[PDB]
Structure 1
Amino acid sequence: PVNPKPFLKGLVNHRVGVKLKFNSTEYRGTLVSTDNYFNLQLNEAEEFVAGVSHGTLGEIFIRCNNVLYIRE
């Protein structure tokens, strides 16, 4: 019963960590909203370059195609 899209709807207004494919970097910020495309938006997103916060990017909008995985 615990599917991805309903857990993602529960993951709205919650802290999330985004990983990507090529020329890529981990993140850590409070998820704002999502859609069927899985376009993301975070507030206080910290650019964890291989688990090392290079810069506090803050208000950001991540593209869907470059997403690899999303975690706590």
Structure 2
Amino acid sequence: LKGLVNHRVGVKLKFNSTEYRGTLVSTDNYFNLQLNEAEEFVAGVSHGTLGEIFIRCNNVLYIRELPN
């Protein structure tokens, strides 16, 4: 996962279809991650900008690299 630090990513949660997008500032094996300039996406539509958020592994389905 460290290969995605300082990259634009999207974190998808288990429930609903919400995706947090931002820059991956940091993380840990535990999949606990810090996201900078995060923006909440629901079914692909922005529902706003949170600032920096710290997200818990458990709620996470997967992480992907947002496209260039």
TM-score (norm 1): 0.82
Bigger strand fraction: 2
Separation of aligned partners in 2, 1:53 and 1:22: 17
Q: CA deviation at 1:24?
A: 4.9
Q: CA deviation at 1:58?
A: 1.9
Alignment RMSD: 1.2
Q: Which runs of 4+ in 1 moved over 2 A?
A: none
Which one has the largest radius of gyration? 1
Q: CA deviation at 1:21?
A: 1.2
Separation of aligned partners in 2, 1:59 and 1:24: 20
What are structure 2's unaligned runs of at least 5 residues?
A: none
User: Identity across aligned pairs (percent)?
Assistant: 100
**Structure 1 residue matching 2:48: 3-state secondary structure:** strand
Q: CA deviation at 1:35?
A: 0.7
TM-score (norm 2): 0.86
